[PDB]
Amino acid sequence: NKFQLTPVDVITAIKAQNAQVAAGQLGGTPPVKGQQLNASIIAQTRLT
Amino acid sequence: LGKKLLEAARAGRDDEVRILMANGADVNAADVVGWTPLHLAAYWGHLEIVEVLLKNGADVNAYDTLGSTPLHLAAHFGHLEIVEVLLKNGADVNAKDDNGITPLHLAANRGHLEIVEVLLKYGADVNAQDKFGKTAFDISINNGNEDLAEILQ
Amino acid sequence: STEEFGKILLKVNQDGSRVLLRDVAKIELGGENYDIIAEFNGQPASGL
């Protein structure tokens, strides 16, 4: 209450900041020919 | 009486349609949505039944409960020969349905270039707007139909 | 069809000009994924 927050805000923040987020790949198919590197992009992963 | 003819026109039964009118069936009979035998023949693409129906005094400008005519249907579904026959027999080329949609709008939307030309030949208002202010040209631009866009200029 | 997807309306500008999907993207039929490419005796192919 001091910060005008509720459990709704707590839940929303946890769901946003403790999550697995899909990204993609560098040089993924279909590529520009001449691409020399293909690598997965890792974005947000769950807290620990 | 007319129900027999409405079905026979739909099924495309040339003989049946003749026999039913030799017996004096109403040629402007309407079904539950206001479609006449000429509507059905135009929709399903039965040119012979269209001709034989018009010869017997079919109302060529009949409109259904939403205001669409057989010319709307024939133009919409790419039935070139039926469009010509209808127009030859006095079909309102600028007929608007309840939405303000004309046969040119419908032909334009489906990219029936040949049918568009026939409609313009018979005096279709290229600047006619539907309820949303759209012309056949607006439709051709939105659809990206280059061939049609130039024909409308 | 690609034609129908291309004319998906994204927004209308204040001048009334329309932004369609084909104005921000190329629209084509293409593989669900592009990872597998097969050849039969050196010639392009598919298979099961």
Coordinates of N, CA and C in Angstrom, one line a residue:
Chain A
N1 N 0.8 -1.2 0.0 CA 0.0 0.0 0.0 C 0.9 1.3 0.0
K2 N 2.0 1.2 0.7 CA 2.9 2.4 0.7 C 3.3 2.8 -0.7
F3 N 3.5 1.8 -1.6 CA 3.9 2.1 -2.9 C 2.7 2.0 -3.9
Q4 N 1.5 2.0 -3.4 CA 0.3 1.9 -4.2 C 0.3 0.6 -5.2
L5 N 0.8 -0.5 -4.6 CA 0.9 -1.7 -5.4 C 0.0 -2.8 -4.7
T6 N -0.3 -3.8 -5.5 CA -1.2 -4.9 -5.1 C -0.6 -6.3 -5.6
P7 N -1.1 -7.4 -5.1 CA -0.6 -8.7 -5.6 C -0.7 -8.8 -7.1
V8 N -1.7 -8.1 -7.7 CA -1.8 -8.2 -9.2 C -0.5 -7.7 -9.8
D9 N 0.1 -6.6 -9.3 CA 1.3 -6.0 -9.8 C 2.5 -7.0 -9.6
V10 N 2.5 -7.6 -8.4 CA 3.6 -8.6 -8.1 C 3.5 -9.7 -9.1
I11 N 2.3 -10.3 -9.4 CA 2.2 -11.4 -10.3 C 2.6 -11.0 -11.7
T12 N 2.1 -9.8 -12.2 CA 2.5 -9.4 -13.5 C 4.0 -9.2 -13.7
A13 N 4.6 -8.6 -12.6 CA 6.1 -8.4 -12.7 C 6.8 -9.8 -12.7
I14 N 6.4 -10.7 -11.9 CA 7.1 -12.0 -11.9 C 6.9 -12.7 -13.3
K15 N 5.8 -12.6 -13.8 CA 5.5 -13.3 -15.1 C 6.4 -12.6 -16.2
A16 N 6.6 -11.3 -16.1 CA 7.4 -10.7 -17.1 C 8.9 -10.9 -16.9
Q17 N 9.4 -10.9 -15.7 CA 10.8 -10.9 -15.4 C 11.4 -12.3 -15.0
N18 N 10.5 -13.3 -14.9 CA 10.9 -14.7 -14.7 C 10.2 -15.5 -15.8
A19 N 10.9 -15.6 -17.0 CA 10.3 -16.2 -18.2 C 11.3 -16.6 -19.2
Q20 N 10.9 -17.5 -20.0 CA 11.7 -18.0 -21.1 C 11.2 -17.3 -22.4
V21 N 12.1 -16.7 -23.2 CA 11.7 -15.9 -24.3 C 12.4 -16.4 -25.6
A22 N 11.6 -16.8 -26.6 CA 12.2 -17.3 -27.8 C 12.7 -16.1 -28.6
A23 N 13.8 -16.4 -29.3 CA 14.4 -15.3 -30.2 C 14.5 -15.8 -31.6
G24 N 15.6 -16.6 -31.9 CA 15.7 -17.1 -33.2 C 17.2 -17.4 -33.5
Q25 N 17.7 -17.2 -34.7 CA 19.0 -17.5 -35.1 C 19.7 -16.4 -35.9
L26 N 21.0 -16.2 -35.7 CA 21.8 -15.5 -36.7 C 22.1 -16.4 -37.9
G27 N 22.0 -15.8 -39.1 CA 22.3 -16.6 -40.2 C 21.4 -17.8 -40.4
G28 N 20.1 -17.7 -39.9 CA 19.2 -18.8 -40.1 C 18.7 -18.9 -41.5
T29 N 18.1 -20.1 -41.8 CA 17.6 -20.3 -43.2 C 16.2 -19.6 -43.3
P30 N 15.8 -19.1 -44.5 CA 16.7 -19.0 -45.7 C 17.7 -17.9 -45.5
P31 N 19.0 -18.1 -45.8 CA 20.0 -17.1 -45.5 C 20.3 -16.3 -46.7
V32 N 21.1 -15.2 -46.5 CA 21.8 -14.6 -47.6 C 23.0 -15.5 -48.0
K33 N 23.1 -16.0 -49.2 CA 24.2 -16.7 -49.6 C 25.5 -15.9 -49.3
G34 N 26.6 -16.6 -48.9 CA 27.8 -16.0 -48.5 C 27.9 -15.9 -47.0
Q35 N 26.8 -16.1 -46.3 CA 26.8 -16.1 -44.8 C 27.8 -17.2 -44.3
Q36 N 28.6 -16.8 -43.4 CA 29.7 -17.7 -42.9 C 29.4 -18.3 -41.5
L37 N 28.4 -17.8 -40.8 CA 28.1 -18.3 -39.4 C 26.6 -18.4 -39.2
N38 N 26.3 -19.5 -38.5 CA 24.9 -19.7 -38.1 C 25.0 -20.0 -36.6
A39 N 24.2 -19.3 -35.8 CA 24.2 -19.4 -34.3 C 22.9 -19.1 -33.8
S40 N 22.5 -19.8 -32.7 CA 21.2 -19.6 -32.0 C 21.4 -18.3 -31.2
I41 N 20.3 -17.5 -31.2 CA 20.2 -16.4 -30.3 C 19.5 -16.8 -29.0
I42 N 20.1 -16.5 -27.9 CA 19.6 -16.8 -26.5 C 19.1 -15.4 -26.0
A43 N 17.8 -15.3 -25.6 CA 17.3 -14.1 -25.0 C 17.0 -14.4 -23.5
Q44 N 15.9 -13.9 -23.0 CA 15.6 -14.0 -21.6 C 15.4 -15.5 -21.2
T45 N 16.0 -15.9 -20.1 CA 15.8 -17.2 -19.5 C 15.3 -17.1 -18.1
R46 N 14.7 -18.1 -17.5 CA 14.1 -18.1 -16.2 C 15.2 -17.8 -15.1
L47 N 14.7 -17.1 -14.1 CA 15.5 -16.8 -12.9 C 15.9 -18.0 -12.2
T48 N 16.9 -17.9 -11.4 CA 17.5 -19.1 -10.7 C 17.8 -19.0 -9.2
Chain B
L1 N -45.7 -24.4 -59.3 CA -45.8 -23.4 -60.4 C -44.5 -22.7 -60.7
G2 N -44.2 -21.7 -59.9 CA -43.0 -21.0 -60.0 C -41.8 -21.7 -59.3
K3 N -42.1 -22.4 -58.2 CA -41.1 -23.1 -57.5 C -40.5 -24.2 -58.5
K4 N -41.4 -24.9 -59.2 CA -40.9 -25.8 -60.2 C -39.9 -25.1 -61.2
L5 N -40.2 -23.9 -61.6 CA -39.3 -23.1 -62.5 C -38.1 -22.6 -61.8
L6 N -38.2 -22.2 -60.6 CA -37.0 -21.7 -59.8 C -36.0 -22.8 -59.7
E7 N -36.4 -24.1 -59.4 CA -35.5 -25.2 -59.3 C -35.0 -25.5 -60.7
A8 N -35.8 -25.6 -61.7 CA -35.4 -26.0 -63.0 C -34.3 -25.1 -63.5
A9 N -34.5 -23.8 -63.3 CA -33.5 -22.8 -63.7 C -32.2 -23.0 -63.0
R10 N -32.3 -23.3 -61.7 CA -31.1 -23.5 -60.9 C -30.3 -24.8 -61.5
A11 N -31.0 -25.9 -61.6 CA -30.4 -27.1 -62.1 C -29.9 -27.0 -63.5
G12 N -30.3 -26.0 -64.3 CA -29.9 -25.8 -65.6 C -30.6 -26.7 -66.6
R13 N -31.9 -27.0 -66.4 CA -32.6 -28.0 -67.2 C -33.3 -27.2 -68.3
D14 N -32.7 -27.2 -69.5 CA -33.3 -26.3 -70.6 C -34.7 -26.8 -71.0
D15 N -34.9 -28.1 -71.2 CA -36.2 -28.6 -71.6 C -37.2 -28.2 -70.5
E16 N -37.0 -28.7 -69.3 CA -37.9 -28.4 -68.2 C -38.4 -27.0 -68.2
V17 N -37.5 -26.0 -68.3 CA -37.8 -24.6 -68.2 C -38.8 -24.3 -69.3
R18 N -38.6 -24.8 -70.5 CA -39.5 -24.6 -71.6 C -40.8 -25.2 -71.4
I19 N -40.9 -26.4 -70.9 CA -42.2 -27.1 -70.7 C -43.0 -26.3 -69.6
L20 N -42.2 -25.8 -68.5 CA -42.9 -25.2 -67.4 C -43.5 -23.8 -67.8
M21 N -42.8 -23.2 -68.8 CA -43.4 -21.9 -69.3 C -44.4 -22.1 -70.4
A22 N -44.3 -23.2 -71.1 CA -45.4 -23.5 -72.0 C -46.7 -23.8 -71.2
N23 N -46.6 -24.2 -70.0 CA -47.7 -24.4 -69.0 C -48.1 -23.1 -68.3
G24 N -47.4 -22.0 -68.6 CA -47.7 -20.7 -68.0 C -47.2 -20.4 -66.6
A25 N -46.1 -20.9 -66.3 CA -45.5 -20.6 -65.0 C -45.0 -19.2 -64.9
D26 N -45.1 -18.6 -63.7 CA -44.6 -17.2 -63.5 C -43.1 -17.2 -63.7
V27 N -42.6 -16.3 -64.7 CA -41.2 -16.2 -65.0 C -40.5 -15.3 -64.0
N28 N -41.2 -14.5 -63.2 CA -40.7 -13.6 -62.2 C -40.9 -14.2 -60.8
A29 N -41.2 -15.4 -60.7 CA -41.4 -16.0 -59.4 C -40.1 -15.8 -58.5
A30 N -40.3 -15.6 -57.2 CA -39.3 -15.2 -56.3 C -39.2 -16.3 -55.2
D31 N -38.0 -16.6 -54.8 CA -37.8 -17.6 -53.7 C -37.7 -16.8 -52.4
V32 N -37.3 -17.5 -51.3 CA -37.4 -16.8 -50.0 C -36.4 -15.7 -49.8
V33 N -35.4 -15.6 -50.6 CA -34.4 -14.5 -50.6 C -34.7 -13.5 -51.8
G34 N -35.8 -13.6 -52.5 CA -36.1 -12.7 -53.5 C -35.4 -13.0 -54.9
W35 N -34.9 -14.2 -55.0 CA -34.2 -14.6 -56.3 C -35.2 -15.1 -57.3
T36 N -35.1 -14.6 -58.5 CA -36.0 -15.1 -59.6 C -35.2 -16.2 -60.4
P37 N -35.9 -16.9 -61.3 CA -35.2 -17.9 -62.1 C -34.1 -17.3 -62.9
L38 N -34.2 -16.0 -63.2 CA -33.1 -15.3 -63.9 C -31.9 -15.1 -63.0
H39 N -32.1 -14.8 -61.7 CA -31.0 -14.7 -60.7 C -30.3 -16.0 -60.7
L40 N -31.0 -17.1 -60.5 CA -30.4 -18.4 -60.4 C -29.6 -18.8 -61.6
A41 N -30.2 -18.6 -62.8 CA -29.5 -18.9 -64.1 C -28.3 -18.1 -64.2
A42 N -28.3 -16.8 -63.8 CA -27.2 -15.9 -63.9 C -26.1 -16.4 -62.9
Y43 N -26.5 -16.7 -61.7 CA -25.5 -17.1 -60.7 C -24.8 -18.4 -61.1
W44 N -25.5 -19.4 -61.5 CA -24.9 -20.7 -61.8 C -24.4 -20.8 -63.3
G45 N -24.6 -19.7 -64.0 CA -24.0 -19.7 -65.4 C -24.7 -20.5 -66.4
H46 N -26.0 -20.4 -66.5 CA -26.8 -21.1 -67.5 C -27.3 -20.1 -68.5
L47 N -26.4 -19.9 -69.6 CA -26.7 -18.8 -70.5 C -28.0 -19.1 -71.3
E48 N -28.2 -20.4 -71.7 CA -29.4 -20.7 -72.5 C -30.7 -20.4 -71.7
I49 N -30.7 -20.8 -70.5 CA -31.9 -20.5 -69.7 C -32.1 -19.0 -69.5
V50 N -31.0 -18.3 -69.4 CA -31.1 -16.8 -69.3 C -31.8 -16.3 -70.6
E51 N -31.3 -16.7 -71.7 CA -31.9 -16.2 -73.0 C -33.4 -16.6 -73.1
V52 N -33.7 -17.9 -72.9 CA -35.1 -18.4 -72.9 C -35.9 -17.7 -71.9
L53 N -35.4 -17.4 -70.8 CA -36.2 -16.7 -69.7 C -36.5 -15.2 -70.2
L54 N -35.5 -14.5 -70.7 CA -35.7 -13.1 -71.1 C -36.7 -13.1 -72.3
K55 N -36.6 -14.1 -73.2 CA -37.5 -14.1 -74.3 C -39.0 -14.2 -73.9
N56 N -39.2 -14.8 -72.7 CA -40.6 -15.0 -72.2 C -40.9 -13.8 -71.2
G57 N -40.2 -12.7 -71.3 CA -40.6 -11.5 -70.5 C -40.0 -11.5 -69.1
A58 N -38.9 -12.2 -68.8 CA -38.3 -12.2 -67.5 C -37.9 -10.7 -67.2
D59 N -38.3 -10.3 -66.0 CA -37.8 -8.9 -65.6 C -36.3 -8.9 -65.4
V60 N -35.6 -8.2 -66.3 CA -34.2 -8.2 -66.3 C -33.6 -7.4 -65.2
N61 N -34.4 -6.5 -64.6 CA -33.9 -5.7 -63.5 C -34.5 -6.1 -62.1
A62 N -35.0 -7.3 -62.1 CA -35.5 -7.8 -60.8 C -34.3 -7.7 -59.8
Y63 N -34.7 -7.5 -58.5 CA -33.7 -7.4 -57.4 C -34.2 -8.2 -56.2
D64 N -33.2 -8.7 -55.5 CA -33.5 -9.6 -54.4 C -33.7 -8.8 -53.1
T65 N -33.9 -9.4 -52.0 CA -34.2 -8.7 -50.8 C -33.0 -7.8 -50.3
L66 N -31.8 -7.9 -50.9 CA -30.8 -7.0 -50.6 C -30.5 -6.1 -51.8
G67 N -31.3 -6.1 -52.8 CA -31.2 -5.1 -53.9 C -30.3 -5.5 -55.1
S68 N -29.8 -6.8 -55.1 CA -28.9 -7.2 -56.2 C -29.7 -7.8 -57.3
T69 N -29.3 -7.5 -58.5 CA -29.9 -7.9 -59.8 C -29.2 -9.1 -60.4
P70 N -29.7 -9.7 -61.4 CA -29.0 -10.8 -62.1 C -27.7 -10.3 -62.7
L71 N -27.6 -9.0 -63.1 CA -26.4 -8.5 -63.7 C -25.3 -8.4 -62.6
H72 N -25.6 -8.0 -61.4 CA -24.7 -8.1 -60.3 C -24.1 -9.5 -60.2
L73 N -24.9 -10.6 -60.2 CA -24.5 -11.9 -60.1 C -23.6 -12.3 -61.3
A74 N -24.1 -12.1 -62.5 CA -23.3 -12.6 -63.7 C -22.0 -11.9 -63.7
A75 N -21.9 -10.6 -63.5 CA -20.7 -9.8 -63.5 C -19.8 -10.3 -62.4
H76 N -20.3 -10.6 -61.2 CA -19.5 -11.0 -60.1 C -18.8 -12.3 -60.3
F77 N -19.5 -13.3 -60.9 CA -19.0 -14.6 -61.1 C -18.4 -14.9 -62.5
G78 N -18.1 -13.8 -63.2 CA -17.3 -14.0 -64.4 C -18.0 -14.6 -65.6
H79 N -19.4 -14.4 -65.7 CA -20.1 -15.0 -66.8 C -20.3 -14.0 -67.9
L80 N -19.3 -13.9 -68.7 CA -19.2 -12.8 -69.7 C -20.4 -12.9 -70.6
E81 N -20.7 -14.0 -71.3 CA -21.8 -14.1 -72.2 C -23.1 -13.7 -71.6
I82 N -23.3 -14.0 -70.3 CA -24.6 -13.7 -69.7 C -24.7 -12.2 -69.4
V83 N -23.6 -11.6 -69.1 CA -23.5 -10.1 -68.9 C -24.0 -9.4 -70.2
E84 N -23.4 -9.8 -71.3 CA -23.8 -9.2 -72.6 C -25.3 -9.4 -72.9
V85 N -25.8 -10.6 -72.8 CA -27.2 -10.9 -73.0 C -28.1 -10.0 -72.1
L86 N -27.8 -10.0 -70.8 CA -28.6 -9.2 -69.9 C -28.6 -7.7 -70.3
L87 N -27.4 -7.2 -70.6 CA -27.3 -5.8 -71.1 C -28.1 -5.6 -72.4
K88 N -27.9 -6.4 -73.3 CA -28.6 -6.4 -74.6 C -30.1 -6.3 -74.4
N89 N -30.6 -6.9 -73.3 CA -32.0 -6.9 -73.0 C -32.4 -5.9 -72.0
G90 N -31.7 -4.8 -71.9 CA -32.2 -3.7 -71.0 C -31.8 -3.7 -69.6
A91 N -30.7 -4.4 -69.2 CA -30.3 -4.5 -67.8 C -29.6 -3.2 -67.4
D92 N -30.1 -2.7 -66.3 CA -29.5 -1.5 -65.7 C -28.1 -1.7 -65.4
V93 N -27.2 -1.0 -66.2 CA -25.7 -1.2 -66.0 C -25.2 -0.6 -64.7
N94 N -26.0 0.4 -64.2 CA -25.6 1.2 -63.0 C -26.4 0.8 -61.8
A95 N -27.1 -0.3 -61.8 CA -27.9 -0.8 -60.7 C -27.1 -0.9 -59.4
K96 N -27.6 -0.3 -58.3 CA -27.0 -0.3 -57.0 C -27.8 -1.3 -56.1
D97 N -27.1 -2.1 -55.4 CA -27.8 -2.9 -54.3 C -27.8 -2.1 -53.1
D98 N -28.4 -2.6 -52.0 CA -28.6 -1.9 -50.8 C -27.3 -1.3 -50.2
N99 N -26.1 -1.9 -50.6 CA -24.8 -1.4 -50.2 C -24.3 -0.3 -51.1
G100 N -25.0 0.1 -52.1 CA -24.4 1.0 -53.1 C -23.4 0.3 -54.0
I101 N -23.5 -1.0 -54.2 CA -22.5 -1.8 -55.0 C -23.1 -2.0 -56.3
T102 N -22.3 -1.8 -57.4 CA -22.8 -1.9 -58.8 C -22.1 -3.1 -59.4
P103 N -22.6 -3.6 -60.5 CA -21.9 -4.7 -61.2 C -20.5 -4.4 -61.6
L104 N -20.2 -3.1 -61.9 CA -18.8 -2.8 -62.1 C -17.9 -3.0 -60.9
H105 N -18.4 -2.6 -59.7 CA -17.7 -2.9 -58.5 C -17.3 -4.3 -58.4
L106 N -18.3 -5.2 -58.5 CA -18.2 -6.6 -58.4 C -17.2 -7.2 -59.4
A107 N -17.4 -6.9 -60.7 CA -16.5 -7.3 -61.7 C -15.1 -6.9 -61.4
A108 N -14.9 -5.6 -61.1 CA -13.6 -5.1 -60.7 C -13.0 -5.8 -59.6
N109 N -13.7 -6.1 -58.6 CA -13.1 -6.8 -57.4 C -12.6 -8.1 -57.7
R110 N -13.2 -8.9 -58.6 CA -12.8 -10.2 -59.0 C -11.9 -10.2 -60.2
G111 N -11.5 -9.0 -60.7 CA -10.6 -8.9 -61.8 C -11.0 -9.5 -63.1
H112 N -12.3 -9.4 -63.4 CA -12.9 -9.9 -64.7 C -12.8 -8.8 -65.7
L113 N -11.6 -8.7 -66.3 CA -11.3 -7.6 -67.2 C -12.2 -7.5 -68.4
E114 N -12.5 -8.6 -69.0 CA -13.4 -8.6 -70.2 C -14.8 -8.1 -69.8
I115 N -15.3 -8.5 -68.6 CA -16.6 -8.1 -68.2 C -16.6 -6.6 -67.9
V116 N -15.5 -6.1 -67.3 CA -15.4 -4.7 -67.0 C -15.6 -3.9 -68.3
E117 N -14.9 -4.3 -69.4 CA -14.9 -3.6 -70.6 C -16.4 -3.5 -71.2
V118 N -17.1 -4.6 -71.1 CA -18.4 -4.7 -71.6 C -19.3 -3.7 -70.8
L119 N -19.1 -3.7 -69.5 CA -19.9 -2.8 -68.7 C -19.6 -1.3 -69.0
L120 N -18.4 -1.0 -69.2 CA -18.0 0.4 -69.6 C -18.6 0.7 -70.9
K121 N -18.6 -0.3 -71.8 CA -19.1 -0.1 -73.2 C -20.6 0.3 -73.1
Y122 N -21.4 -0.3 -72.2 CA -22.8 0.0 -72.0 C -23.0 1.2 -71.1
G123 N -22.0 2.0 -70.7 CA -22.2 3.2 -70.0 C -22.2 3.0 -68.5
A124 N -21.2 2.3 -67.9 CA -21.1 2.2 -66.5 C -20.3 3.4 -65.9
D125 N -20.9 4.0 -64.9 CA -20.3 5.2 -64.3 C -19.0 4.7 -63.5
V126 N -17.9 5.0 -64.0 CA -16.6 4.6 -63.4 C -16.5 5.3 -62.0
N127 N -17.2 6.5 -61.8 CA -17.0 7.2 -60.6 C -18.1 6.9 -59.6
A128 N -18.9 5.9 -59.8 CA -19.9 5.5 -58.9 C -19.3 5.0 -57.6
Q129 N -19.8 5.5 -56.5 CA -19.2 5.1 -55.2 C -20.2 4.2 -54.5
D130 N -19.7 3.2 -53.7 CA -20.5 2.4 -52.8 C -20.7 3.1 -51.5
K131 N -21.3 2.5 -50.5 CA -21.6 3.1 -49.3 C -20.4 3.6 -48.5
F132 N -19.2 3.1 -48.9 CA -18.0 3.4 -48.2 C -17.2 4.4 -49.1
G133 N -17.8 5.0 -50.2 CA -17.1 5.9 -51.0 C -16.1 5.4 -52.0
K134 N -16.1 4.1 -52.2 CA -15.2 3.4 -53.0 C -15.7 3.3 -54.5
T135 N -14.8 3.5 -55.4 CA -15.0 3.3 -56.8 C -14.4 2.0 -57.3
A136 N -14.7 1.6 -58.5 CA -14.1 0.5 -59.2 C -12.6 0.7 -59.3
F137 N -12.2 2.0 -59.4 CA -10.7 2.3 -59.5 C -10.1 2.1 -58.1
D138 N -10.7 2.6 -57.1 CA -10.2 2.3 -55.7 C -10.0 0.8 -55.5
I139 N -10.9 0.0 -56.0 CA -10.8 -1.4 -55.8 C -9.6 -2.0 -56.5
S140 N -9.4 -1.5 -57.8 CA -8.3 -2.0 -58.5 C -6.9 -1.6 -57.9
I141 N -6.9 -0.4 -57.3 CA -5.6 0.0 -56.7 C -5.4 -0.8 -55.4
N142 N -6.4 -0.9 -54.5 CA -6.2 -1.7 -53.3 C -5.8 -3.1 -53.6
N143 N -6.4 -3.7 -54.7 CA -6.1 -5.1 -55.0 C -4.8 -5.2 -55.7
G144 N -4.2 -4.1 -56.2 CA -3.0 -4.2 -57.0 C -3.1 -4.8 -58.4
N145 N -4.3 -4.6 -59.0 CA -4.5 -5.2 -60.3 C -4.1 -4.1 -61.3
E146 N -2.9 -4.2 -61.8 CA -2.4 -3.2 -62.7 C -3.2 -3.1 -64.0
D147 N -3.4 -4.3 -64.6 CA -4.2 -4.3 -65.9 C -5.5 -3.6 -65.8
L148 N -6.2 -3.8 -64.6 CA -7.5 -3.2 -64.5 C -7.4 -1.7 -64.2
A149 N -6.4 -1.3 -63.3 CA -6.3 0.1 -63.0 C -6.2 1.0 -64.2
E150 N -5.4 0.6 -65.2 CA -5.2 1.5 -66.4 C -6.5 1.5 -67.2
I151 N -7.2 0.4 -67.3 CA -8.5 0.4 -68.0 C -9.5 1.5 -67.5
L152 N -9.3 1.8 -66.2 CA -10.2 2.7 -65.5 C -9.6 4.1 -65.5
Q153 N -9.0 4.6 -66.6 CA -8.4 5.9 -66.6 C -8.3 6.4 -68.1
Chain C
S1 N -4.6 -16.3 -50.8 CA -3.6 -16.0 -51.8 C -2.7 -14.9 -51.3
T2 N -1.5 -14.8 -51.9 CA -0.6 -13.7 -51.5 C -1.3 -12.3 -51.8
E3 N -2.1 -12.2 -52.9 CA -2.7 -11.0 -53.2 C -3.6 -10.5 -52.0
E4 N -4.4 -11.4 -51.4 CA -5.2 -11.0 -50.3 C -4.4 -10.6 -49.1
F5 N -3.3 -11.4 -48.8 CA -2.5 -11.0 -47.7 C -1.9 -9.6 -47.9
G6 N -1.4 -9.3 -49.1 CA -0.7 -8.1 -49.4 C -1.6 -6.9 -49.1
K7 N -2.9 -7.0 -49.3 CA -3.8 -5.8 -49.1 C -4.4 -5.8 -47.7
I8 N -3.8 -6.6 -46.8 CA -4.2 -6.4 -45.4 C -3.9 -5.0 -45.0
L9 N -4.9 -4.3 -44.3 CA -4.8 -2.9 -44.0 C -4.1 -2.8 -42.6
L10 N -2.9 -2.2 -42.6 CA -2.2 -2.0 -41.3 C -2.7 -0.7 -40.6
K11 N -2.8 0.4 -41.3 CA -3.3 1.6 -40.8 C -3.6 2.6 -41.9
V12 N -4.4 3.6 -41.6 CA -4.6 4.7 -42.5 C -4.0 6.0 -41.9
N13 N -3.2 6.7 -42.7 CA -2.5 7.9 -42.3 C -3.5 9.1 -42.2
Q14 N -3.1 10.2 -41.6 CA -4.0 11.3 -41.5 C -4.3 11.9 -42.9
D15 N -3.4 11.9 -43.8 CA -3.7 12.3 -45.2 C -4.6 11.3 -45.9
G16 N -5.1 10.3 -45.3 CA -5.9 9.3 -45.9 C -5.2 8.2 -46.7
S17 N -3.8 8.4 -46.8 CA -3.0 7.4 -47.5 C -3.1 6.1 -46.6
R18 N -3.1 4.9 -47.3 CA -3.3 3.6 -46.7 C -2.0 2.9 -46.7
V19 N -1.6 2.3 -45.5 CA -0.5 1.5 -45.4 C -0.9 0.0 -45.4
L20 N -0.6 -0.7 -46.4 CA -0.9 -2.1 -46.6 C 0.2 -3.0 -46.2
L21 N -0.1 -4.3 -45.9 CA 1.0 -5.2 -45.5 C 2.1 -5.3 -46.6
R22 N 1.7 -5.3 -47.9 CA 2.7 -5.4 -48.9 C 3.6 -4.2 -49.0
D23 N 3.3 -3.1 -48.2 CA 4.1 -1.9 -48.2 C 5.2 -2.1 -47.1
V24 N 5.2 -3.1 -46.3 CA 6.2 -3.3 -45.3 C 6.8 -4.7 -45.4
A25 N 6.4 -5.5 -46.3 CA 6.9 -6.9 -46.4 C 6.7 -7.4 -47.8
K26 N 7.5 -8.4 -48.1 CA 7.3 -9.2 -49.3 C 6.4 -10.4 -49.0
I27 N 5.4 -10.7 -49.8 CA 4.4 -11.7 -49.6 C 4.6 -12.8 -50.6
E28 N 4.9 -14.0 -50.2 CA 5.1 -15.2 -51.1 C 4.8 -16.5 -50.3
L29 N 4.3 -17.5 -51.1 CA 4.3 -18.8 -50.6 C 5.8 -19.3 -50.5
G30 N 6.1 -19.9 -49.3 CA 7.4 -20.5 -49.1 C 7.3 -21.5 -48.0
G31 N 8.4 -22.3 -47.8 CA 8.4 -23.4 -46.9 C 8.1 -22.9 -45.5
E32 N 7.3 -23.8 -44.7 CA 7.2 -23.6 -43.3 C 8.6 -23.4 -42.6
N33 N 9.6 -24.2 -43.1 CA 11.0 -24.0 -42.7 C 11.8 -24.3 -44.0
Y34 N 13.1 -23.8 -43.9 CA 13.9 -23.8 -45.1 C 15.2 -24.6 -44.8
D35 N 15.1 -25.5 -43.8 CA 16.3 -26.2 -43.3 C 16.7 -27.4 -44.2
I36 N 15.8 -28.0 -45.0 CA 16.1 -29.3 -45.6 C 16.0 -29.1 -47.1
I37 N 17.1 -29.4 -47.8 CA 17.2 -29.3 -49.3 C 17.9 -30.6 -49.8
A38 N 17.1 -31.3 -50.6 CA 17.6 -32.6 -51.1 C 17.9 -32.6 -52.6
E39 N 18.7 -33.5 -53.0 CA 19.1 -33.7 -54.4 C 19.1 -35.1 -54.8
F40 N 18.6 -35.4 -56.0 CA 18.7 -36.8 -56.6 C 19.7 -36.7 -57.7
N41 N 20.8 -37.4 -57.6 CA 21.8 -37.5 -58.6 C 22.2 -36.0 -59.0
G42 N 22.4 -35.2 -58.1 CA 22.8 -33.8 -58.3 C 21.7 -32.8 -58.7
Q43 N 20.5 -33.3 -58.9 CA 19.3 -32.5 -59.4 C 18.4 -32.2 -58.3
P44 N 17.8 -31.0 -58.2 CA 16.9 -30.7 -57.1 C 15.7 -31.7 -57.0
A45 N 15.4 -32.0 -55.8 CA 14.3 -33.0 -55.5 C 13.7 -32.8 -54.2
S46 N 12.6 -33.5 -54.0 CA 12.0 -33.8 -52.7 C 11.9 -35.3 -52.5
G47 N 11.3 -35.7 -51.4 CA 11.2 -37.1 -51.1 C 10.5 -37.3 -49.8
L48 N 10.2 -38.6 -49.6 CA 9.6 -39.1 -48.3 C 10.5 -40.2 -47.8

